[PDB]
Amino acid sequence: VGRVVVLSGPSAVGKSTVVRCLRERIPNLHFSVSATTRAPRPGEVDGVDYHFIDPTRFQQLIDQGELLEWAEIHGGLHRSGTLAQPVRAAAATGVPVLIEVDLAGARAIKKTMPEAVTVFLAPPSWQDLQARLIGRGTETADVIQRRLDTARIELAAQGDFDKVVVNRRLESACAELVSLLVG
């Protein structure tokens, strides 16, 4: 049975650096393809970038417990979520699965799919995260303050996850996740 790993952590901890390392290192890694009710942008492929479905069909899927998690996007402009069945099929076939979601999405998946391993990508220190939130200093004080408070709140979620990987270094954070994904 394929392992299913749900990767999350703070907004702006550096998650997507790691994700692409994962996809190069594990050749058959199934990266979950979210369902969405928005329309395709040019170059997007149904089945690959998203599963493009209509709102009504998406509501059926909600109603029938077919989404491991879902959210309203941009205040309900449209919806996106993770379909259960492709993940379960991939795992039954023996292929590893990675699902990248925010913290609310990870919590919802732990209820709908308890055998999924939730992993929190933590910064190596508060100072490392803070330096990246401040960044080039292009944002206002009020926005930065909000970012810092958000980060401290997100960081307190980390104890609920099955595992924590500390993002001390790209190559090892990636390595720890490879070992998780292929046992």
Residues in contact with Cl ion by CB under 5 A are 107, 110, 118, 160-161
Find all residues with CB under 8 Å of 38, minimum gap 6, and list them: 50, 52, 73, 77, 78, 80
Around Cβ 92, how many Cβ atoms within 10 Å? 10
Side-chain half-sphere exposure of 88, counting CA atoms within 13 A: 10
For the bound state, the minimum distance from the C-beta of residue 27 to Cl ion, rounded and expressed in Å, comes to 28
Question: Which token pair is 22?
Answer: 């994962």
Known binder of ligand: residue 89?
Answer: no
Closer residue to Cl ion (CB): 74 or 111: 111
Known binder of ligand: residue 14?
Answer: yes
Closer residue to Cl ion (CB): 149 or 160: 160
| Chain residue whose CB lies nearest Cl ion | 110
Known binder of ligand: residue 13?
Answer: yes
| Nearest residue to 146 (alpha-carbon basis) of 158, 159, 134 | 134
Known binder of ligand: residue 104?
Answer: no
Assign 52 to helix, strand or coil.
strand
For the bound state, the minimum distance from the C-beta of residue 6 to Cl ion, rounded and expressed in Å, comes to 8
Closer residue to Cl ion (CB): 36 or 118: 118
30-31 and 97-100 beta bridge pairing:
parallel
Q: Which stretches of 117-181 are assigned E, i.e. beta strand?
A: 117-122, 163-166
For the bound state, the minimum distance from the C-beta of residue 9 to Cl ion, rounded and expressed in Å, comes to 12
- Helix, strand, coil % in the chain, rounded to nearest 5: 45, 20, 35
For the bound state, the minimum distance from the C-beta of residue 106 to Cl ion, rounded and expressed in Å, comes to 5
Question: Which token pair is 12?
Answer: 């702006």
Known binder of ligand: residue 9?
Answer: yes
For the bound state, the minimum distance from the C-beta of residue 103 to Cl ion, rounded and expressed in Å, comes to 8
Closer residue to Cl ion (CB): 61 or 113: 113
Closer residue to Cl ion (CB): 3 or 107: 107
- Binding residue ranges for ATP: 9-16
